[PDB]
Amino acid sequence: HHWGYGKHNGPEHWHKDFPIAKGERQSPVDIDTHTAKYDPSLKPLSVSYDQATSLRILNNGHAFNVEFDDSQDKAVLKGGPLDGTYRLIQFHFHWGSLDGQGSEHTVDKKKYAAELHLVHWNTKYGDFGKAVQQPDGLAVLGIFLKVGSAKPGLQKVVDVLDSIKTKGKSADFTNFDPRGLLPESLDYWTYPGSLTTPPLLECVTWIVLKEPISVSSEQVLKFRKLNFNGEGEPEELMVDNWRPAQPLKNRQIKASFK
Ligand SMILES: OC[C@H]1O[C@@H](O)[C@H](O)[C@@H](O)[C@@H]1O
Ligand SMILES: OC[C@H]1O[C@@H](O)[C@H](O)[C@@H](O)[C@@H]1O
Ligand SMILES: OC[C@H]1O[C@H](O)[C@H](O)[C@@H](O)[C@@H]1O
Ligand SMILES: Nc1ccc(S(N)(=O)=O)cc1
Ligand SMILES: Nc1ccc(S(N)(=O)=O)cc1
Ligand SMILES: Nc1ccc(S(N)(=O)=O)cc1
Numbered sequence: 001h002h003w004g005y006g007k008h009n010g011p012e013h014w015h016k017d018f019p020i021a022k023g024e025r026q027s028p029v030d031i032d033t034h035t036a037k038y039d040p041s042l043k044p045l046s047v048s049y050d051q052a053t054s055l056r057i058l059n060n061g062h063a064f065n066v067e068f069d070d071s072q073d074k075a076v077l078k079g080g081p082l083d084g085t086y087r088l089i090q091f092h093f094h095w096g097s098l099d100g101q102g103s104e105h106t107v108d109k110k111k112y113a114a115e116l117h118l119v120h121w122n123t124k125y126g127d128f129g130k131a132v133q134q135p136d137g138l139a140v141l142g143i144f145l146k147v148g149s150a151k152p153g154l155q156k157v158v159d160v161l162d163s164i165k166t167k168g169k170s171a172d173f174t175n176f177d178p179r180g181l182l183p184e185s186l187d188y189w190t191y192p193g194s195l196t197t198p199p200l201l202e203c204v205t206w207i208v209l210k211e212p213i214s215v216s217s218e219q220v221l222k223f224r225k226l227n228f229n230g231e232g233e234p235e236e237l238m239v240d241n242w243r244p245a246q247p248l249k250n251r252q253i254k255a256s257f258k
């Protein structure tokens, strides 16, 4: 009964070990596009990934993380709602058992097939661990995935998954360019929220891009061949690793675009 995504240990149970699950700033949320308001105070968003240094890909039993060298300002996120510089540490996805579900955020209640999270920490706090003690410690860039044409910049990820099928397996994953996971437009919504997995800490400025990326059915089908379980254990396919939308409470979602 470690946390997970089963009927016995999924999102409806997390509050028992992580009472912040019922907090005032939880994520994800439904993005009501008609209520979100353009904010002229937002500065231009800068996604600066040209010098990124990927290192490894890990099946952590809940998703797979592509990890980056964050020992210095190499891949960073600035501008928009953010004060200062946020350094890329890892990205991962959430996805469904079927194309009709998988995203964490929803857009006018619409669920996408998957959602990419590029996770960054505020460099003024020195390390990720200190950043998650702060109300402005993290910035997560969220990108929706729909199923259509293949995303060429995702294929290297897809093709390594057979080598990290089970929990605890990792593989080298150097020289991966995360620019290849972005859509064309950087239009976004933003709001203050939390990590979407335990420990559910309320440290995140969410920046959710409006434009989805398209991936092929074959690409997302390979996500669904991963396992939540470790090697040797009964196979439990890694699917439906998403938390549903949580109450908006006393928050407003701002839009970068008129
Ligand atoms: O290899 C992935 C990326 O790594 C970066 O460090 C390089 O500067 C980019 O040119 C390259 O696309
Ligand atoms: O009092 C007026 C203000 O209300 C706030 O809730 C909105 O975020 C602002 O955009 C608006 O100017
Ligand atoms: O860029 C990520 C990975 O893509 C492919 O798997 C390459 O064969 C490997 O060398 C690289 O680490
Ligand atoms: N019954 C139960 C208790 C706690 C959890 S947890 N680790 O997700 O909070 C899950 C199920
Ligand atoms: N330094 C570090 C990088 C990535 C991660 S991970 N596996 O949580 O993405 C943890 C620590
Ligand atoms: N450690 C951690 C980092 C990011 C997230 S998420 N799913 O909110 O990006 C959850 C936990």
Ligand SMILES: [Zn+2]
Pocket: 092, 093, 094, 117, 196
């Ligand atoms: Zn996530």
